[PDB]
Write a protein that binds this ligand. Sequence first.
Ligand SMILES: Cc1ccc(C(=O)Nc2cccc(C(F)(F)F)c2)cc1-c1ccc2nc(N)ncc2c1
Ligand SMILES: Cc1ccc(C(=O)Nc2cccc(C(F)(F)F)c2)cc1-c1ccc2nc(N)ncc2c1
Lengths: 244, 244
Amino acid sequence: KPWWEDEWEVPRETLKLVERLGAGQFGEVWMGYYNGHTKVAVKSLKQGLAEANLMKQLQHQRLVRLYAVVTQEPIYIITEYMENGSLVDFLKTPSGIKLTINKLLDMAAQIAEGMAFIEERNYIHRDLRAANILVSDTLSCKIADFGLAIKWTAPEAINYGTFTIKSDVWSFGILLTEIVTHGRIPYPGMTNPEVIQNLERGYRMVRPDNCPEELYQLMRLCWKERPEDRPTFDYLRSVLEDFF
Amino acid sequence: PWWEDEWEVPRETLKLVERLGAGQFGEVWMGYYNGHTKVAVKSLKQGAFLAEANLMKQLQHQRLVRLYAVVTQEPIYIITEYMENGSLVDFLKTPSGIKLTINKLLDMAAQIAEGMAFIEERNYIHRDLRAANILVSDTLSCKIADFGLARLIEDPIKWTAPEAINYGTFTIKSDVWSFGILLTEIVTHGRIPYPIQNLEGYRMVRPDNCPEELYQLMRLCWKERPEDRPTFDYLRSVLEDFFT
Ligand SMILES: Cc1ccc(C(=O)Nc2cccc(C(F)(F)F)c2)cc1-c1ccc2nc(N)ncc2c1
Ligand SMILES: Cc1ccc(C(=O)Nc2cccc(C(F)(F)F)c2)cc1-c1ccc2nc(N)ncc2c1
């Protein structure tokens, strides 16, 4: 209505979905094109939005950038498209398999920086993991959420569905293992029911081979049983950035 | 009347997220209009203010912060565009700040001078001209503003002219003196002036790295007799036609 308002819409006609990147209970994720020549990522939401405003308000160097939206259902949320894809997938590429722990921790630092912002803005991610992290053109990390829906979930969240930023901290610790191992799934050779049963007895993932004991203690801080005992993301970023 | 400009919006459409400042007369916040339009919001304390909004509209110019809308219900809100780089004193400090060359540092000075030149035209008097009140766009362009919130606007010791401090006689010439002071903040990455009332007939020593030609300008700005100071129209030309 007002002349100064940002117009974030585009006609559905201007989009061409080319390759489905993922599918979930609430929709799909595609690689496509806007107006014939601008490559973009599109999240189609199964009909039968607050996400876009959220993305706009979390606009940050460390979070995926919102481009536009299609107002009529199926609702579309358009963003920048990342050639390098998700962190988990990129860590398994030749380029990624070769990254030194120094570079890997810089990426962890970037992630911590973004979560520190999310914490600043009082939001809660709820699905933090390498799979939801996008790698930019310059190999930097950008927080995202596209599972469209566990080994990454805090005990309190598993047992009582109580999610807070401290729960995100737990997930972050798990993410660190994915990072140092170049994409190994957490709890190697352990099924979800086995993970929950071991957590019932205070189990914690063993330190990965090649993971410095110092980094491992950081992880252990993230997995403290009491949510309140876990560190802040501002702390985590600080330690990771000044790690070496 | 059907033809009167529309300029109000329901308060409910605004989400104030980060306070940017506060003074005796209110606060300044970064917020969002209807979810995805980033804006700056001034909330003036209930217990006159709309006169500021009319003034801004009347002074509408490329070099002055752009008014968007207001909330007419007390507390009164004044909504404007949001400048991503904030104030110039802030930006001049950024690493990407003063990594700038006299060339750019000076184009910004000329923009400010252009702004004041218009203020001069419109017979307005700023009275609080300092780098802290200058806003920097995303494209590093500068715009004149006023948000210290310490005085009611109606159509700053180290930046105020002797006659202003002494007899409270503020004029465009007083702003000229302030500009001269503002220039020192520009060649110093926002260093505080006079690294003063009692020395004021003392004058600032040239700053380290400032062009003697850019000093002789500051001195003309700092002439004792207000009428001897140069019109902004003049400062605008010299700041632009600098390296010719
Ligand atoms: C098209 C799209 C739309 C929204 C979001 C997204 O992350 N949404 C979101 C929803 C809630 C909260 C967040 C937060 F906070 F993490 F930023 C983010 C992500 C994507 C998206 C999914 C997959 C992708 N793959 C590749 N290779 N490039 C880009 C994308 C972008
Ligand atoms: C929300 C707001 C309302 C009014 C004025 C303002 O400058 N008003 C004004 C009052 C008197 C005279 C003038 C003049 F001369 F500049 F036009 C201007 C400024 C602002 C304002 C404060 C802080 C900000 N920070 C950032 N990062 N972006 C934008 C703003 C806008």
